Design a protein around this ligand. Sequence first.
Ligand SMILES: COc1ccc2nc(C)c(O[C@@H]3C[C@H]4C(=O)N[C@]5(C(=O)NS(=O)(=O)C6(C)CC6)C[C@H]5/C=C\CCCCC[C@H](NC(=O)OC5(C)CCCC5)C(=O)N4C3)nc2c1
Ligand SMILES: [Zn+2]
Length: 199
Amino acid sequence: HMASMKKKGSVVIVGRINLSGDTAYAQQTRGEEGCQETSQTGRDKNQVEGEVQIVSTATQTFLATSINGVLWTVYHGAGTRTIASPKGPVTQMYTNVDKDLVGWQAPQGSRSLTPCTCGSSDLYLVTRHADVIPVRRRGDSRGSLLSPRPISYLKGSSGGPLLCPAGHAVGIFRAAVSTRGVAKAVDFIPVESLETTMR
Ligand SMILES: COc1ccc2nc(C)c(O[C@@H]3C[C@H]4C(=O)N[C@]5(C(=O)NS(=O)(=O)C6(C)CC6)C[C@H]5/C=C\CCCCC[C@H](NC(=O)OC5(C)CCCC5)C(=O)N4C3)nc2c1
Ligand SMILES: [Zn+2]
């Protein structure tokens, strides 16, 4: 009934993929208990840093990537959820289920990637475990793994970036192309699609 209807919690930043040095590694900034509390209140006063965030709901964990001052992730992870912030839940400024794409204003302290203008097809995918996977672009929204890997390896990395050799954002990791459980290619939201959504 109406009085007892529940409210879905906010997406919560629980860590980041550190790319600021010569070694890529995942950092956790909030544990599961604090994540559950923060999802319900929508108040998150933890310091945010970097370009790639690890995010979580009550039931899923995945990635989010800052590009052009917008923290982007996948609709199949975030739905229409708000994101927790120091002053309370923040509503999505972009939602496109047809692209599996959502976005919030980038948190204070985060750094944003620059959209790629290189026109280059030698890409790199960053996973939630801080693995940097070489990927050859095969189309507007597809890229092949130079070394295929079980889909278990990529699970939880949707919302992560595909980057060019110069570190520009080329797309947002959306889905794995799987055959007999082996990921030979990835599907991603092109950064141009994000730019069109922004307009
Ligand atoms: C509900 O509204 C919407 C709207 C749009 C939409 N568009 C979609 C494309 C869409 O796909 C669904 C979600 C996505 C997915 O699992 N992605 C992640 C991921 O990590 N997720 S995640 O972080 O674990 C999580 C689950 C958020 C917490 C990256 C991959 C890692 C491992 C793969 C595991 C096996 C799934 C393989 C699927 N392969 C696949 O469909 O390949 C096609 C056929 C499509 C294109 C290439 C060929 C796949 O990858 N899938 C299915 N769902 C939606 C849902
Ligand atoms: Zn580039």
